[PDB]
Design a protein around this ligand. Structure first.
Ligand SMILES: Nc1nc2c(ncn2[C@@H]2O[C@H](COP(=O)(O)OP(=O)(O)OP(=O)(O)O)[C@@H](O)[C@H]2O)c(=O)[nH]1
Ligand SMILES: Nc1nc2c(ncn2[C@@H]2O[C@H](COP(=O)(O)OP(=O)(O)OP(=O)(O)O)[C@@H](O)[C@H]2O)c(=O)[nH]1
Ligand SMILES: Nc1nc2c(ncn2[C@@H]2O[C@H](COP(=O)(O)OP(=O)(O)O)[C@@H](O)[C@H]2O)c(=O)[nH]1
Ligand SMILES: [Mg+2]
Ligand SMILES: [Mg+2]
Lengths: 152, 432, 48, 438, 36, 432
């Protein structure tokens, strides 16, 4: 006999009901509550907006961040090139470059990655080489000095 | 018709007492808004013991809510069943005790205990006849210990003929959550043996062993401990709120458990605690509730009941149940192992039957144990205090608020007198 | 049991083993193994 | 409202605060513009940002910080950086000439004029706050401005704002690698200034952070920007409990009541447990016992002294994110049984645990990866006596020939109180020995 | 409420993602947090 | 939970290690990325881990074979901390792997052992995979085995060492490395299993019609032997053979712990359909000398103890019939002091096939691990190679210069001559 009829709302007995009150619960609601959107690098732009000073600053800051990330070991640039080629060829494709940037975990938009790939592709072969990669990501290359050179 | 006034104190007592108001409001049918929606007429039988009246059928608890930091009353009010408390009872400080007994008892407590007592005197004068004051707090804390025991001293002078239940948590011997816990524990007990009428000792690392091994909970969160505590504090009062065959009020459990005014420390237990997956595997019966009651791994105190003889004991059975089976089982547990019970008290164990079981189960029981084995918990706290006080460690944070070092001397002289008094009655024979 | 059975048979066993000098064992095992390898070299498979 | 004021003195202080407030803007969602975007349907998140940001007008949040320096070349980088709009234009305080590694200029000659403007901005920020909890002072011991102006500022804050706690995060001179010659002179003079004025001190060693970045973030060419980023994780996790609710809240007054036994011993250590890089992380969740063990390892500790020599007088653990109260007790219990770490005989139970509910955040492009659990451990130990006697030897062999003294005595400072700072440091070395002795 | 509920629900989902029998545990291990 | 930690040392250890974990992941359905294929499923896949990490360690002083695993198809299954590399290889020298350059890595290797031992609940044994012809397999293998006996007791050590072929070898100092390594396997390894490359070639050439086999073809069926012997722990069956069942029934004496191996149904894809593969004829083909993984004739010696482990749909009725047909043959000879000479284990799971592998899908298989006195035939040939090379004392300045002394050569040789005497004494019979 249950003279106290009904399961009721709120917590009940230990081993009978969960800790959470039945008034507020019984559903996996807040397991992924973040309270804030992911914050980008302040210099980057989601859209392209080419031909502008803000785009020049975004490209310069992105290349400087990439250079500082890839020039930490003595041979981190070669190691990252090896980890990013993927298809065992010595060249790097668009999807492999995208996957490498995602592995480096910099929150960069797809169009901005494509723009960086286009500036890296000096010979316009549709495919980066080791020379193009290292020339863009030297430790104090001209694309890194473009961060200092804002007035152009 | 007789009412119990609940006081919760500090960060520890607020979250512990919040879960107590989680379970009683559901077990009496109060929804989070404050109205009534249960379909049982026994829920509305004795609501006055823990709920007041309001317009439109609203029932608000007799709770005075206390801490020196306003952070916890943001957390208490935000959850479910947090809107049922009156905001006038949300008396809060600004600075915070910060795990210092001196700040809670002397400086920041005396500036706040005047406004707190006005809330308590409001609730005492409102109801018909006080059964007693129930307090849930901490001993190693700063607000539940420093200013919690300040309220106990103040409210004992104003109401000296009333009961006093203290569900106070104690530091663990294995791992301590605060470095200055032995200072705050030893100062609290000296202020608590003279004032508090009876006391229930809780320990977190006894509850961790309960959660891991009885509830099969691999990663027990901080509030699952409170729900085990909340069921006992609801189970301590089952005879008051509901009819039964034998009724045991707070004073009835006082007279049957403390033989002497200074031996008022209990270790408390909780019987029908099986895992969720074992609800069909465990066959519930009166021998099964009795067997898990006296098991030493079931006790919510860190002290081992097999080390010291049980002075007295009490059982609060709930549910439609046979009075002969308990009465045969209580004789059986006393006569199977007589070495764990003191010889000069016949009938160590008191039994009370409430015929209305809790929600979801048809039989339940709550165990109160007045054992001399609780001196082992007091001796471990004593050993910590003597090791620290000899070299005056962490003492400038206590003498800064006016508590001289002479106050710490009698905090130990009544501490070691407890374990001396608990040792003698254990060693006491029927003759001498 | 020990003295009547186990000590006696272990004495016989250790006496025969100590009589056996090890170089004879390596010579005999080398000859047998070389015979097996010669058969499995010049013959299409060995079957039990 | 629980709310603190962070002062950053000198080049090292203002460069840490550039990275310290960078993480504070990202936890509370404050943009570099200074405006908080509307999120879901909430009336207000006032208790979250009020500890660091004051709501001004409509949707504008300004920090409760003072960036004061005698040189303008390090404060104008903030004024032209990404956060040019966030700060109040007069909270950033510049000077004409720097102290230039001179403790005499920062205390007597040129630091006297600029300290008057500091208290004017402190009094205005103290008036804005309802309940102030404590001043978090960030400075460099080895620099002229940080040691000099920091000594004058903390003396003024003690007289005006009595008994309010002062948590000192001081960059301290390193045993082997250091960037300046007269650092042992500037280190010994400010020690007497911060012995009795600040209440909790956290020693930060630059070579110790170099060792941590080399073996945890696997970078052997770090930058001070990388160094100050995981300094920011230490301070943010330390005051994480004021910002966000948790099971075991630990406030600033909770720190000084548990982490110092005696008034003259308050020099602490620092360690941040899960430090995994962006690429190395993949999907790696670490156990609570693993990160607790990694916190107490001597290699993962942020001041250059070995805890194996000294005795842990007091210790606290700030846990963040999805950590339960049980496994922290299981983690502590095996630390007590681990004999390679030792506690003093007069502190048999010496742990404090603070569990906050907010998982730590990561800056974009930062080296640290997104982790759901973290331990920030600051502990008091007698191993600081190795630190203070290390540059005591450096100062003793320098003062004997009286080299680099004509600069100090020329700028108003007297000859005789070099020995006052040395005898005060001598008494501090004796204090650590007799307290830790069994 | 959302922060506390997130903490409680993540604790509950840790409880449910432990006590799971993979069946090939002789030569495989899940991860140290689930092997605590 | 029952578990075994495996250790793969050297070139041959982790090339088998690539093959064994290829078969291990396919048996349990584990994908190459490590994850076995509504709100909980999102939680279980990204924030938590349904990933299964192997309990193995891949250590070698030469990085080229280690980074092949780091850059291969199984880069995500293994922890990056789990695979251990080195600067310079031991370079076909027991002196370098045991004294000079194996000493620096063996301290790092035991740290990852300690992490794998803490991760497990209950440990049962240790698998060691190495080659006794190479310096890293012999030197670092002996160094790791010597240290594993110190820190860990009551935990068995299983050895699968690829011993050199009598005719063909890929090295010239091959007799020196195996003699010195043999003294370590007698002293520190509980169970060691001989493996001979030339015998695997003959199995691949004849019964599996591969004219041009490589090491990838060899390791695919050596992994079949290793996976079958520990398969009773992973899967259930009618009769189980645990890792402690294996010791207690195949070592009559502590020094004799050398066992052969055999896999019965080595049949190609084309030949499978015409072949009738019942329990009666695979066991007859299990004892076939052409089907043994060690190039030795078992008819030279006599079996002491033999364990027949079965996979697939095998009833216990016909494995007993296969026992009786073998015991009545005059070519298969048992020693007189072991009447009950067989242990039969049945596992219900049929043997999985590697995709692209040479072996076909069969529903019955026998993994025959037998203790025989024909191991002394193997060690006698390897001894005569050692005696000719040591008479001129060639290839000794490499060993003497890198830490070892001259006396270790005669000491390890003297232990092997005892083993030659030990088989001739134990295998002796009592007649009339
Ligand atoms: N950790 C850390 N330390 C720094 C940083 N910047 C400077 N330092 C320390 O500062 C010391 C040099 O003194 P500074 O702080 O630059 O001098 P100052 O405080 O500006 O005093 P003046 O130069 O006279 O104005 C060096 O030894 C560094 O250890 C930083 O960004 N991070
Ligand atoms: N079955 C099998 N045996 C192999 C394989 N690779 C090497 N071996 C054995 O290894 C022996 C050669 O010695 P290694 O194992 O290569 O020596 P190592 O492990 O490189 O040790 P170091 O030379 O000191 O670096 C040969 O005789 C083979 O029997 C393999 O892939 N499969
Ligand atoms: N069982 C239980 N124990 C708690 C709870 N909250 C705090 N504690 C314990 O209380 C001690 C700390 O209390 P504290 O916050 O310092 O109390 P205060 O100083 O009065 O605010 C710790 O040992 C905790 O284990 C709770 O909700 N349940
Ligand atoms: Mg400067
Ligand atoms: Mg090799």
């Amino acid at each position: 006999p249950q003279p106290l009829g009904g399961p009721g709302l709120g917590v009940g007995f230990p081993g009978v009901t969960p800790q959470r009150a039945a008034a507020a619960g019984t559903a996996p609601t807040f397991w992924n509550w973040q309270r804030h959107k992911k914050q980008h690098v302040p210099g980057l732009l989601e859209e392209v907006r080419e031909g502008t000073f803000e785009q020049a600053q975004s490209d310069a800051l992105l290349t400087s961040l990439m250079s500082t990330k890839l020039n930490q070991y003595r041979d981190k640039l070669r190691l990252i090139f090896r980890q990013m080629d993927g298809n065992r060829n010595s060249l790097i494709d668009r999807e492999e470059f995208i996957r490498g940037i995602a592995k480096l975990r910099i929150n960069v938009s797809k169009a901005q990655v494509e723009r960086l790939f286009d500036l890296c592709d000096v010979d316009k072969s549709g495919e980066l080489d080791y020379e193009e990669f290292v020339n863009r990501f030297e430790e104090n290359g001209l694309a890194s000095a473009a961060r200092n050179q804002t007035r152009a | 018709m007789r009412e119990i006034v609940h006081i919760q104190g500090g960060q520890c007592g607020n979250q512990i007492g919040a879960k107590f108001w989680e379970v009683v409001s559901d077990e009496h049918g109060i929804d989070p808004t404050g109205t009534y929606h249960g379909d049982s007429d026994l829920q509305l039988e004795r609501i006055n013991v823990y709920f007041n009246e309001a317009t439109g059928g609203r029932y608000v608890p007799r709770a005075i809510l206390m801490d020196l930091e306003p952070g916890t009353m943001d957390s208490v009010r935000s959850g479910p069943y947090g809107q049922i408390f009156r905001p006038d009872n949300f008396v809060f400080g600004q600075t915070g005790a910060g795990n210092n007994w001196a700040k809670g008892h002397y400086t920041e407590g005396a500036e706040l205990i005047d406004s707190v007592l006005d809330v308590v005197r409001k609730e005492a004068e409102s109801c018909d006849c006080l059964q007693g004051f129930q307090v849930c707090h901490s001993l190693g804390g700063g607000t539940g210990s420093g200013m919690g025991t300040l309220l106990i001293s103040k409210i004992r002078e104003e109401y000296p003929d009333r009961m006093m239940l203290t569900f106070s948590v104690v530091p663990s011997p294995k791992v301590s959550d605060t470095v200055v816990e032995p200072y705050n524990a030893t100062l609290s007990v000296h202020q608590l043996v003279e004032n508090a009428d009876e006391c229930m000792v809780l320990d977190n690392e006894a509850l961790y062993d309960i959660c891991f091994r009885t509830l099969k909970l691999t990663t027990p969160t901080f509030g699952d401990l409170n729900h085990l505590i909340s069921a006992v504090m609801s189970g301590i009062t089952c005879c008051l709120r509901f009819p039964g065959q034998l009724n045991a009020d707070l004073r009835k459990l006082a007279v049957n458990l403390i033989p002497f005014p200074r031996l008022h420390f209990f270790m408390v237990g909780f019987t029908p605690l099986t895992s969720r997956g074992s609800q069909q595997y465990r066959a519930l019966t009166v021998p099964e509730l009795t067997q898990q009651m006296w098991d030493a791994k079931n006790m919510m105190c860190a002290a081992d009941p097999r080390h010291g003889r049980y002075l007295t004991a009490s059982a609060l059975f709930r549910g439609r149940m046979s009075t002969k089976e308990v009465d045969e089982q209580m004789l059986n547990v006393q006569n199977k192992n007589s070495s764990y019970f003191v010889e000069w008290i016949p009938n160590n164990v008191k039994s009370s039957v409430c015929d209305i079981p809790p929600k979801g189960l048809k039989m339940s029981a709550t165990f109160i144990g007045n054992s001399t084995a609780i001196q082992e918990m007091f001796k471990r706290v004593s050993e910590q205090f003597t090791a620290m006080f000899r070299r005056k460690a962490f003492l400038h944070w206590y003498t800064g608020e006016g508590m001289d070092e002479m106050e710490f001397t009698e905090a130990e002289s009544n501490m070691n007198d407890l374990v001396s008094e608990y040792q003698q009655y254990q060693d006491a024979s029927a003759e001498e | 049991w020990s003295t009547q059975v186990f000590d006696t048979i272990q004495g016989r066993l250790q006496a025969a083993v100590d009589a056996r000098d090890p170089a004879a064992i390596e010579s005999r095992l080398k000859t047998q193994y070389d015979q097996y390898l010669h058969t499995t070299n010049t013959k299409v498979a060995v079957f039990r | 409202m629980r709310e603190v004021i962070s002062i950053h003195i000198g080049q090292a202080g203002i460069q840490v605060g550039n990275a310290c407030w960078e993480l504070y803007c990202l936890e509370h969602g404050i943009q570099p513009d200074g405006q908080m975007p509307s999120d879901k349907t909430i009336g207000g998140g006032d208790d979250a940002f009020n500890t660091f940001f004051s709501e001004t007008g409509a949707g504008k949040h300004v920090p409760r910080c003072i960036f004061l320096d005698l040189e303008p070349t390090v404060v104008d980088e903030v004024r032209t950086g990404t956060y040019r709009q966030l700060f109040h234009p007069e909270q950033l305080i510049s000077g004409k000439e720097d102290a230039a590694n001179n403790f005499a200029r920062g205390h007597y000659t040129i630091g006297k004029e600029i300290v008057d403007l500091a208290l004017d901005r402190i009094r205005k920020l103290a008036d804005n706050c309802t309940g102030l909890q404590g001043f978090l002072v960030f400075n460099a011991v080895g620099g002229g401005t940080g040691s000099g102006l920091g000594s004058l500022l903390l003396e003024r804050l003690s007289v005006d704002y009595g008994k309010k706690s002062k948590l000192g995060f001081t960059v301290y001179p390193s045993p082997q690698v250091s960037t300046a010659v007269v650092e042992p002179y500037n280190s010994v003079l400010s020690t007497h200034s911060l012995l009795e004025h600040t209440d909790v001190a956290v020693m930060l060693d630059n070579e110790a952070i170099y060792d941590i970045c080399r073996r945890s973030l696997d970078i052997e060419r770090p930058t001070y920007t990388n160094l100050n980023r995981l300094i920011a994780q230490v301070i943010s996790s330390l005051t994480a409990s004021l910002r966000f609710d948790g099971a075991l809240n630990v406030d600033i007054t909770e720190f000084q009541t548990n982490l110092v036994p005696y008034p003259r011993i308050h020099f602490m250590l620092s360690s941040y447990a899960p430090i995994i890089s962006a690429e190395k992380a993949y999907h790696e969740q670490l156990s609570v016992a693993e990160i607790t063990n990694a916190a107490f390892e001597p290699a993962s500790m942020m001041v250059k002294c070995d805890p194996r020599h000294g005795k842990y007088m007091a210790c606290c653990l700030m846990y963040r994110g999805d950590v339960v109260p049980k496994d922290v007790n299981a983690s502590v219990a095996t630390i007590k049984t681990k004999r390679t770490i030792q506690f003093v005989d007069w502190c048999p139970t010496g742990f404090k645990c603070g569990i906050n509910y907010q998982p730590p955040t990561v800056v974009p492009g930062g080296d640290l990866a997104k982790v759901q659990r973290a331990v920030c451990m600051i502990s008091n130990s007698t191993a600081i006596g190795e630190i203070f006697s290390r540059l005591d030897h450096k100062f003793d062999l320098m003062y004997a020939k009286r080299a680099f003294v004509h600069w100090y005595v020329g700028e108003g400072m007297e000859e005789g109180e070099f020995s006052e700072a040395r005898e005060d440091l001598a008494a501090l070395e004796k204090d650590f020995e007799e307290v830790g002795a069994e | 409420r959302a922060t506390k509920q997130r903490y409680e629900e993540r604790a509950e989902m840790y409880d449910r993602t432990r006590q799971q029998h993979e069946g090939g545990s002789c030569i495989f291990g899940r991860l140290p947090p689930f092997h605590e």
